[PDB]
A paper describes a structure:
Here, we elucidate the structure and function of Retron-Eco2, which comprises a non-coding RNA (ncRNA) that encodes multicopy single-stranded DNA (msDNA, a DNA‒RNA hybrid) and a fusion protein containing a reverse transcriptase (RT) domain and a topoisomerase-primase-like (Toprim) effector domain. The retron RT reverse-transcribes the msd segment of the ncRNA (msdRNA) into DNA (msdDNA), which, together with the msr segment (msrRNA), forms a single-stranded branched DNA‒RNA hybrid named multicopy single-stranded DNA (msDNA). The full-length Eco2 RT-Toprim protein consists of an N-terminal RT domain (residues 1‒368) and a C-terminal Toprim domain (residues 369‒586). Upon activation, the Toprim effector domain exhibits RNase activity, degrading RNA to arrest phage replication.
Overall, Retron-Eco2 forms a trimeric, cyclic assembly composed of three msDNA molecules and three RT-Toprim proteins (three msDNA-RT-Toprim units). In the Retron-Eco2 trimer, the msDNA-RT portions from each protomer together adopt a triangular architecture, with the Toprim domains protruding as three perpendicular “legs” extending from this triangular base. The msrRNA part of each msDNA molecule spans from one RT-Toprim to the next in a head-to-tail fashion, occupying the active sites of the RT domain. The 5’-end tail includes IRa2, rG15, and the single-stranded RNA a (ssRa) segment (rA16‒rU19), while the 3’-end tail consists of the ssRb (rG43‒rU51) and the RNA portion of the DNA‒RNA duplex. These tails and the RSL region interact tightly with the positively charged surface of the RT domain, stabilizing the trimeric assembly. The final 11 nucleotides (rG52‒rA62) at the 3′-end of msrRNA and the nucleotides dT57‒dC67 of msdDNA form the DNA‒RNA duplex, which is located within the RT active site. Analysis of the msdDNA reveals that the last five nucleotides (dC63-dT64-dG65-dC66-dC67) match previous reports, reflecting a post-catalytic state. Interestingly, rU51 — poised as the next nucleotide to be reverse-transcribed — is flipped out and stabilized by π‒π stacking with an aromatic residue F46 in the fingers subdomain. The key catalytic residues of Eco2 are aligned, yet we detect no Ca2+ density at the active site. We propose that, under normal conditions, the flexible msdDNA region occludes the Toprim active site, maintaining the complex in an autoinhibited conformation.
Numbering used by the authors:
A (entry chain A), B (entry chain I): 1 to 538, 542 to 586
C (entry chain E): 1 to 535, 542 to 586
Write the structure that this text describes.
DNA sequence: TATTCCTCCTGCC
RNA sequence: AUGUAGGCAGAUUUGUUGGUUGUGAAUCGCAACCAGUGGCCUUAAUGGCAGGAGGAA
DNA sequence: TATTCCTCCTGCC
RNA sequence: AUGUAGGCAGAUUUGUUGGUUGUGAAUCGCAACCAGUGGCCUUAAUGGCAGGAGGAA
DNA sequence: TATTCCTCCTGCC
RNA sequence: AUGUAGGCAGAUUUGUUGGUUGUGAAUCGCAACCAGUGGCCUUAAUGGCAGGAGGAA
């Protein structure tokens, strides 16, 4: 329990009652799912098409066997972690279905190697039969389970005397039983001077030798023929080889480990990144991009899918950056210390494409108005205020599938390290000034596309926006005469779709920030006997604690009367932009 | 004819009358040249020696036949261009005698290939016999000329059976009839993974394989043996292979395509550039260099023989610069804010030698005074004046070849993009001040040789050189504690051979420019109601329009008398420098 | 004396008296040493252990034959230099025991080569028998010595039918007699396209070819086998080949020429440099490092040993730096806008380690206080003052060998180009300000080690150190509060072990320097009728060289005790701080 | 011739 | 007023792979640099693992 | 299954 | 109130050489890049040469 | 042992 | 005063190719880096093509 003695609890168990307690399910429910309704009668088969005529068949547990198997998976994952701790070892050979392991680390193991050999195991899960699972639980030290517990686990895991593909616990059991082959193959590889790794049923054996060892594989004119020692090592561990998938790749072609290039660095497939580039280009250009859904029929993809692809590329990009940092050797020379558009000089071409896509997502292809604020707390204030006045502004909300789960119809931009890296927007005022400065070129970079929604920058009055106001006056000149009239106006219209909303002044014309919009009954509340500092100048608590324990604290019953103004402005802006699209 | 239907006119031609009309020559003259006087009785043979005591014989036509053949060459070149346009193809395989093609593009085709194969065709022009020329004009589907026109073209184009080397129309006919072999060899090369190109009779076949294809050529233990397929392709097209000139070159030796190195980039032969470097060095030291003549005895060789070699090298340098600009790999950089002598860091060694030579030509090895004037209109005024007062100043003129053509004996320096690139003289005041700054080092860089002529810097009085003069009194000390008195003498001697000449001051000593020298009668002469803005800084015609119209145009007979001061100063400077040299 | 005439004098000599006069010894002593007392009886014999089962035996002259052979060695070295000069040639195939030649140049001859062949000659000196030396001295042009002189030289230079390993003259004689094989092998190597060099008995033949010429050496299953041509060219020159030492090295292994890596540049062995790095690290962490001795037991080892190791590495570093300077590549680019710690951007890793060691030597692990100054003559003034006041301050002195060799215990820091390169201390005041700025980080860099001695910056009064005083007021703030009283103290405590000592301020308050501390009469001294410039004039250099340095006048140091008592007060203060 | 939980997307197997 | 004539098209236009980087009206091209002319799997969930984008408390 | 000594240390052979 | 069972550890975790550069609580590791999967010697003085750190006249 | 001509020079074939 | 002798000169000094870059009292050399130890053509107009240097209109 608590990542300390789950394995001890499992070993101590002597009956299905103990096992049911460990899994945290009733004994009646467990033995009803497993035995009353035989586990062999709770699997549905589906198919994944394969280009090689046939298809890949997946057996999946129905509803409740799946829950029991997920519990077994959690138990066995914790047990494996504890075994690793006890034996004082680390996972260096298995990457497939392992916690803390990814395809990136598996590829990194073989980065830059002269020759790479790829083997695939035939019918990986069908090879783990019921006898093998039960025998592993009975015989392998560190488990040595009592017969009843081991048999119950084996029956809850297996379908037709083998591990099904779609069972949640099959991955971990496969890892546990394939550790034997892992160690044998690691010994063999180290013997013949090769790096070895596995990812599910995908074995990679690389070497820096110019010729692969003859005991591992030879390149006959017929093709790649695995050596007898390696083949017998794999077959003596109870697995077969898919002879039609054995590859031997030299440095002069693309060396791929589990989908990633390893010729020089761990990289994405160039074809994949270029296709993501082209899909983003198509989205910017017309209004969308098309992908095949099931049978080659081109259907429009969503922003979610393209963002997921870009994030997949960015995972490898970020890994490479983190690795490059540890090697960076300081150098001489200087530059402009970044300028307008000078923050993209540090970015890749892939990272430049991702930056452009993120900017599009937030400011050019946004499907709802995007609100930019000037800090980490204005977002919480705006969200709370809009939630309180939901009925006052119905048009600022969307509707879910008839469950009263209404959501805010806005993109409240959240600035963090990632938007600082890609967009150059960490929430500072200088950052917003540079944002406005570059807005023209950023807008132009999207192939004449016209955003359908406005981008509203809601920020304080006279507190932060002074240089920005000077820039607006001296450069934009969106109005015939504007010096301080827009310093006190319902809103502003800077550029194509960019608007700015300043916090309304007091009746006396005072310069009031966003927090002044709360009633006086709330600004004076003391948390732990600490006076709420006015905004942040200062025994006192800053705006962070104010937002966390006052504004978001719904029990305090904060009335957002003097917030309606701001929301009203946004509403009007929406209509205004529509008129622009109608003119 | 619109650059599209000259081929149409040739097709429509049906008699010698139509051909003569197309050529724009009287029919009687054409028939006289071709028939009354045998075309074979209008040729002269001369020789070019060959390394192996050999002879390259050239048959060249006389003037009357050469004019007709030049007209035919122009006609057929237009026809070839129109055929290329019509078939919607480009010229990618032929470079020898082609418009818009050079050896640079020929070499660029093979810029970095692993193996080059060079073949040369024996007796290239003696294989285009009369039958081939006449038949090509008869049968090619783009010509299908009437038999009489084709016969007359082949008669004019041909010496006794075959094309003569020296005929103007032989090259274009060679290209037209060698396109057949070009296509055949292009197909053959594409089959065996090789780039193919031709330049006259110089065939290059390059490949990136480490072994040249066995069917194209092999390296036997006797030399290069051409594959039977390639030999048969060349011979079936009616050409012979000069077996003594077949070469196969690896990247370990110099790979040459029509005179240029193609190992990594398209470059000049290193020996040639080094020899040009040495020739310029000899010129700087002793005032002359020596190159062999026809008889074998060394002779001086002028500044135009050199400076043609420099231009030949600069052609390749400029081509490479353009390509680098195309790629340019933009990234961070800091040039250290530039400096004196900092403009030469962007130049490679070859361009540095060229820039040094240009500076020697214009400021250290002049055969006559060099006049440097800021801008681009002052030299126009100076040339017009010096032409107007030719009688007044005979010593400022030199005679031409035979009867009489007197010309300004002064290098009126012209500033342009090339001068800014190589010398850092774009025609501004700042560049002129930097020129004066560097003059001492530039003078010292020429191995102690003393210029034989002055360098006169003609400038307006204090309007632009306000800063320059400060330098002359802050670092140079050219005058004894002079600040504003120096703006009152007809000439100034900065140092060495560098003199300055400011515009004479007005009667009241007011600041003035050389433009004010023009009489005020012709000052306005406004045309179309637009006044001529003298300073072009107050739709008023600028300084260029005024210069062209008023100054360059005759029929006004401008009274050039205010410019007599500048020429008097030039005479005084010449006398001063002559006296100084005699010291 | 007249190296060119020595060759003529030797080849003109005809009697043992002439040879003795050339060697500058009395004929009686020479002939008594060489003949009366057997030359074979004046040789001690000692062994050096070998890694294998063998041992290297060395026979060395006792003490007097050693002197005779030293004179002969100098004579023959001058003769060889003259023979090089007259022949209008230079040495290119031998680096060995040759003047002006080193292992660095020997390795540089073979720098980027594809394959390196290393041969070692067996029993090098044992192959130069007496007959061979005499025959060379007799029948070789450019010497053509009289048989008496040649026989005397051979008798002096030879053990029983051999050249002693420990004889001060065996090196040069071996070089002269191996020149024949040098030319033969140089021509042979040029024939087959190879660089050839010899260093004593270490022959290196290198080629840029990917296959070594079959006539020179070939790789068979047995190993490396030298070709017949090369083996005969060596054997017919009267030398043997140590076959077990023959090596052929491709670029995929460490290519070593006389101890140095050759693969890409001339470099130190990486294992050696890393070992020195680790030894310095152990010295910084603990109080000392350890190294094995002859008997196989670890011992402390002094700063001298580690300093020598670092200097050996720095020799190659400096050679590479000079070559890189020669090649160079002009360009424009900012260099970190100078700033602090930027001077280490020009140093590579080895040079950074050496710089750290030098800084530790002079400021952290110093065994005596280190005096820093702002100029070259300040330290001379302090040294003269301490030498004159030896009896007054025995506490600032130590016995080197106790043989009345008492010497200044104060480690008076001296500045030069090397300290500017490795420490950024050229003596300028701004450099001292930067030094005080960096002192904190430099102190922290030695793994919490506590210095055992102070470090005193002796400067003048508010003349140049004004920047230092401003920095101390606006930063550090050792004292709670000060405006200008810092200029008037016995000493100032700045950091852990760093102190500043200003001169005794004038009673009226006028700023003073080292010169003002001298008596008025001493400052007024004039040489060649020239007054001494405060800062027809004399600079500080002449003042120091002729006035302070020269004890002819028994010059008096009056305003020099005060700084000495200040130094002793600093010593006591730091001792108390350590004992705190 | 700040640390949970709950939707959706990507990728590998 | 003119003034002989011998063979053109196997009918027509930028060889190619990979990797790294940059860039482009881009579901893929182009340019540079490095290495080349072996072979080869390739519509991966509803599950595991590693991530990504949001929303609530 | 600055030009002479003296002491010490390093490295190669 | 619950409910069959047929094979695991040949018992357990980061293959390796050289060069260059950087770096590290370090008598040796680690990372980057380059080239790879041949062989091999190593206790180097009291002598010579090449240097380094100082002290004195 | 202005966009037209004219002169000269370089290079390739 | 003196204080024995056994063979060297095959008689003399920086192996070399190409590319790229830099540089030099230079018709060529030198240095760095990259790749090596195959072969080999070379006096190119008065013609064509591609350029360069100038002058007039």
């Amino acid at each position: 329990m608590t990542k300390t003695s789950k394995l001890d609890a499992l070993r101590a168990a002597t009956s299905r009652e103990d096992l049911a307690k460990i899994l945290d399910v009733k004994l009646v429910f467990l033995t009803n799912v497993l035995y009353r309704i035989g586990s062999d009668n709770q699997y549905t088969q589906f198919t994944i098409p394969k280009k090689g005529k046939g298809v890949r068949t997946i057996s999946a547990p129905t509803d409740r066997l799946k829950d029991i198997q997920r519990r077994i998976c959690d138990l066995l994952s914790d047990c494996r972690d504890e075994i690793f701790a006890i034996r004082k070892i680390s996972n260096n050979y298995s990457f497939g279905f392992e916690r803390g392991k990814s395809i990136i680390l598996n590829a990194y193991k073989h980065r830059g190697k002269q020759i790479i050999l790829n083997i695939d195991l035939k019918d990986f899960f069908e090879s783990f039969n019921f006898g093998r699972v039960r025998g592993y639980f009975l015989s392998n030290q560190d488990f040595l389970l009592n017969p009843v517990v081991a048999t119950t686990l084996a029956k809850a895991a297996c379908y037709n005397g083998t591990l099904p593909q779609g069972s949640p616990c099959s991955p971990i059991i496969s890892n546990l039983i394939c550790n034997i082959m892992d160690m044998r193959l690691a010994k063999l590889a180290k013997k013949y001077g090769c790096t070895y790794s596995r990812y599910a049923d995908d074995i990679t054996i690389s070497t820096n030798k110019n010729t692969f060892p003859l005991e591992m594989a030879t390149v006959q004119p017929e093709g790649v023929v695995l050596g007898k020692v390696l083949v017998k090592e794999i077959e003596n561990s109870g697995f077969e080889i898919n002879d039609s998938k054995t590859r031997l790749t030299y440095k002069t072609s693309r060396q791929e480990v589990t989908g990633l290039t390893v010729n020089r660095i761990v990289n994405i497939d160039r074809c994949y990144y270029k296709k993501t580039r082209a899909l983003a280009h198509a989205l910017y250009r017309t209004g969308e991009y098309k992908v095949p859904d099931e049978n080659g029929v081109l259907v429009s993809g969503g922003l979610d899918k393209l963002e997921g692809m870009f994030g997949f590329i960015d995972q490898v990009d970020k890994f490479n950056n983190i690795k490059k940092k540890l090697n960076k050797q300081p150098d001489r020379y200087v530059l402009t210390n970044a300028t307008l558009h000078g923050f993209k000089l540090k970015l890749n071409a892939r990272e430049k494409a991702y930056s452009k896509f993120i900017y599009y997502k937030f400011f050019h292809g946004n499907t709802c108005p995007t609100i930019i604020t000037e800090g980490k707390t204005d977002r919480i204030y705006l969200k709370a205020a809009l939630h309180s006045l939901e009925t006052s502004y119905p048009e600022l909300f969307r509707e879910k599938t008839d469950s009263k789960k209404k959501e805010i119809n806005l993109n409240i931009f959240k600035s963090n390290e990632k938007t600082k890296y890609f967009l150059d927007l960490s929430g500072g005022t200088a950052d917003l000034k540079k944002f406005v400065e570059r807005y023209k070129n950023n807008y132009a970079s999207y192939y004449g596309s016209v955003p359908k929604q406005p981008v509203i920058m809601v920020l304080d009055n006279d507190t932060g926006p002074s240089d920005l106001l000077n820039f607006l006056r001296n450069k934009v000149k969106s109005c015939p005469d504007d010096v301080t009239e827009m310093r006190k106006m319902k809103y502003i219209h800077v550029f194509y779709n960019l608007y700015i909303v300043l916090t309304p002044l007091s009746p006396s014309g005072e310069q009031t920030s966003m927090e002044d919009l709360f009633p006086k009954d709330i600004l004076d509340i003391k948390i732990d006997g600490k006076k709420f500092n006015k905004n942040n100048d200062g025994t006192e608590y800053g705006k962070h604690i104010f937002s966390m324990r006052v504004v978001r604290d719904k029990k305090r019953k904060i009335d957002f009367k003097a917030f309606c103004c701001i929301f009203d402005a946004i509403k009007d802006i929406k209509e205004h932009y529509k008129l622009m699209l109608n003119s």
